[PDB]
Design a binder for these strands. Structure first.
Ligand SMILES: [Zn+2]
Lengths: 50, 70, 122, 63, 193, 86
RNA sequence: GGGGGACCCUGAGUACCGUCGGUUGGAUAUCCGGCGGGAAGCUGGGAGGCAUCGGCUCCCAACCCUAAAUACGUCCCGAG
RNA sequence: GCGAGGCGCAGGCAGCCGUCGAACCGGGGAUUCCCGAAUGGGACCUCCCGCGGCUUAUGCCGCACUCCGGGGUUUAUCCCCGGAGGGGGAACGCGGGGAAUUGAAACAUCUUAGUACCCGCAGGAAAAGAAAGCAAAAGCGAUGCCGUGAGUAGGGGCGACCGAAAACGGCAGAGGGCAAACUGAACCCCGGGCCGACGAGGUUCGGGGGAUGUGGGGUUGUAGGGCCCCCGUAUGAGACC
């Protein structure tokens, strides 16, 4: 964990950037149709694939 | 910019224009995260596509020159 | 060391004389170059002298020539190099065997070679 | 019967001429013409078919 | 010509000089690798009859295989008494076919044309295989062999399209007894052999 | 890497501005494939200044950030003003 | 392009036999493989469901290629 | 090509693009990071580390293994030139290896079954294909597929079960090339030149093959072909590029 390879670090970075909420303007544009995406994650409950 | 006006100039001018547009794109990308009152939010897209046009037309000119020389 | 189809030891001078006879016959008389043509000439009884190379691999190419020539009463002689045999025959590749049909200007040389072969081992 | 060559492609993509009557493939147009003549000239009266069975078949087909 | 003489000599090797020649040849060969390329064919008449020519694109490869049949590996699960056989088994492909496939494995860019038996002692059997390079312009220019350059003629030895493969598939018989042979073994439920 | 393709954008955070004012250091988000020599050459050629030191790191978001310390003969405040950072 | 010949050529560890294993409706009469033998070769050779002899009938292996009618649907059109 | 809007699923903010014809659509190009057959050499992390040429430098090219056709030398399989194979594909195809549950109301020959599965090899199809055949009053005349022959001949603790072909009626139809006899370099490939049109075709030079046979010829059964002899023919006809 202290010592990390660059490729694994980049994959973790991609997952971290993925984990965020749907934009409010996206919700407004879709008219309350798109409220969430299947990539939401909680670091202590749902773990990463790697 | 337009393909006709891009084709009107030579390779050196195209290269100088490409460098200037890359620097300007970097400056706009900095200002985008700095400020909030962005008058034109399409500057980045327009600059990127002008750079693409310049590179494409410069490569076309190089290919035409090689074909003529051969 | 010599292949099984070689029946006697040929001196170097005799081999050189055979090659010279082949060259003179090519120049002025008539020869057949190639194992197939040599075999056909021997079977038809038109060959005056048969020349066989000692470096033929496999031996099956020219293993019938000594018994066939002995049966048909035709003299034969061995030479070291098939490449030089072909060069004497005039082609640009090696020749496993050559036959002399018309000696031309090498009649006496062919007769001497035949006599020497008959005396040595026939 | 028409004996015009059929173009077929090679493993490397090179062109071959295929005889529509027997399927033989050639790379030389002279070779193709010579084969077509020497092999199927009997269809135009220049020769006879080879084989007793083929001769009987052709005779029965003609009459 | 000399082809008939070569054929006569190789009719029965023990009844000619070929016996001693082969006795020395097998001594030489037993120290050579299993698959090895040779400059010229040993049996020129057989090579010419099968299709060998003296031009660029033809190579000759000698392959040595072990005599006998095959021994099946021990079965790990339960088996019925009719399925326990291990020793008295023989391959459904001939040793000539197996040698051809070994030569094909050794040479990836070539194609098998034919092969012929060239000798055998009490342990080994030797075959000489003709390989053709289908990408050579000399091969492409010859209508006798140019057909091998087509795409659908790839891996013919592996698919059973050589003479040994046809013999193994049973394509040498016609009429009575060859019902389950054509058009293919698989097409006849794989029960024609 | 060829210069003018190295620098992606400047960094305009509070830490960035304090570094500009105090330690004569600019800070750029640059291409990940660029090395310290590439960053130094790019900055020198683009801004006509002399670079004293270059430090690099890779952010948790996958981007590469470079702190470029200029020589005392050159002021980073002028470059920031030219670039609009102020 | 047709007649005659008295000369030459027409594929070998192959066809085939015995035995063993597999396979098959193939049954003393399927096909494949191993082992031990193994020819004729144009004045020639093979087949005709036990083996041999005679007649008669059909054919020429042990080298190679060949489109169309067929099989499928990762795809498309159309339909129910 | 269409002809006034356009900026994906996706109804928002601000902007921008379009009459110099966009968006969209048919065709042709450019860019195309890293890993991956992955291929210069390595991977406990799709990231790292090199050697030769050119290049001022930026930067570009070459360098895996197993072979084929060639050249050179140091003869080390060492260097160079040209060319191949590798991996992927839903189902179908070709060639090999090959069970048991189950049925027989148990079970061993058998069945399940040449099945499931494994291994290898191709294509848009593959394989087969032109009689050392099928048939016997008569005869047919390559292969493949459909109907039927037929649950028949036949196999089988003759138990349970297994199981065709010929002929006949149809779809489609097409036949050719080697080895040898004979001749004997009259030959093929790569590169250059010249005529022709730039193509077909003709000719020439260098290199690599080739007398252990390239090319010409020949492919069949009461035989065919080679060679020899004899008569005739081409003045013509036809095919292909
Ligand atoms: Zn044809």
């Amino acid at each position: 964990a202290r010592n990390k390879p660059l490729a694994k670090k980049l994959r973790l970075a991609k997952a971290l950037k993925q984990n965020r909420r749907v934009p409010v303007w996206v919700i407004v544009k879709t008219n309350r149709r798109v409220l969430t995406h299947p990539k939401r994650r909680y670091w202590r409950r749902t773990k990463l694939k790697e | 910019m337009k393909p006709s006006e891009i084709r009107e100039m030579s390779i050196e001018e195209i290269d100088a224009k490409i460098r200037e547009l890359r620097l300007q794109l970097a400056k706009e990308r900095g200002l985008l995260t700095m400020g909030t009152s962005l008058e034109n939010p399409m500057v980045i897209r327009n600059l990127r596509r002008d750079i693409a046009r310049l590179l494409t037309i410069k490569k076309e000119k190089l290919r035409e020159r090689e074909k003529g020389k051969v | 060391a010599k292949p099984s189809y070689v029946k006697f030891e040929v001196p170097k001078e005799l081999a050189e004389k055979a090659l010279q006879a082949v060259e003179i016959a090519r120049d002025t008389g008539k020869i057949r170059k190639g194992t197939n043509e040599t075999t056909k000439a021997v079977e038809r009884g038109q060959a005056k002298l048969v020349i066989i190379a000692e470096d033929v691999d496999p031996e099956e190419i020219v293993a019938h020539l000594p018994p066939l020539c002995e049966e048909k009463e035709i003299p034969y002689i061995y030479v070291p190099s098939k490449k030089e045999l072909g060069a004497a025959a005039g082609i640009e590749v090696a020749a496993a065997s050559v036959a002399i049909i018309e000696p031309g200007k090498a009649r006496d040389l062919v007769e001497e070679i035949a006599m020497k072969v008959k005396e040595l081992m026939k | 019967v028409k004996l015009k060559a059929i173009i077929v492609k090679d493993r490397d993509g090179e062109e071959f001429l295929r005889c529509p009557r027997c399927g033989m493939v050639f790379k030389r147009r002279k070779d193709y013409t010579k084969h077509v003549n020497k092999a199927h000239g009997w269809l135009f009266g220049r020769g006879k078919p080879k084989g007793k069975r083929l001769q009987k078949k052709y005779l029965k087909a003609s009459q | 010509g000399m082809y008939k003489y070569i054929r006569e000599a190789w009719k029965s090797p023990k009844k000619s000089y070929v016996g001693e020649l082969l006795k020395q040849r097998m001594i030489k060969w037993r120290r050579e690798p299993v698959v090895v390329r040779i400059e010229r064919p040993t049996r020129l008449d057989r090579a010419r009859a099968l299709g060998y020519q003296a031009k660029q694109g033809y190579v000759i490869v000698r392959v040595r295989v072990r005599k006998g049949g095959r021994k099946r590996p021990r079965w790990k699960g339960g088996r019925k008494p009719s399925k326990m056989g291990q020793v008295k088994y023989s391959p459904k492909k001939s040793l000539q076919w197996i040698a051809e496939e070994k030569a094909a494995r050794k040479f990836p860019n070539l194609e098998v044309l034919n092969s012929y038996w060239v000798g055998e002692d009490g342990m080994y059997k030797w075959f000489e295989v003709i390989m053709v390079d289908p990408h050579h312009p000399v091969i492409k220019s010859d209508p006798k062999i140019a057909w091998i350059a087509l795409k659908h003629h790839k891996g013919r030895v592996f698919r059973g399209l050589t003479s040994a493969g046809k013999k193994g598939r049973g394509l040498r018989n016609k009429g009575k007894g060859a019902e389950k042979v054509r058009p293919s073994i698989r097409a006849n439920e794989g029960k024609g052999k | 890497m060829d210069p003018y393709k190295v620098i992606i954008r400047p960094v305009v955070t509070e830490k960035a501005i304090s570094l500009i004012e105090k330690e004569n250091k600019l800070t750029f988000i640059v291409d990940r494939r660029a090395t310290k020599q590439d960053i130094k050459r790019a900055v020198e050629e683009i801004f006509n200044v002399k670079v004293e030191k270059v430090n690099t790191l890779i952010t948790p978001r996958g981007e590469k950030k470079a702190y470029v310390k200029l020589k005392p003969e050159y002021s980073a405040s002028e470059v920031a003003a030219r670039l609009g950072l102020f």
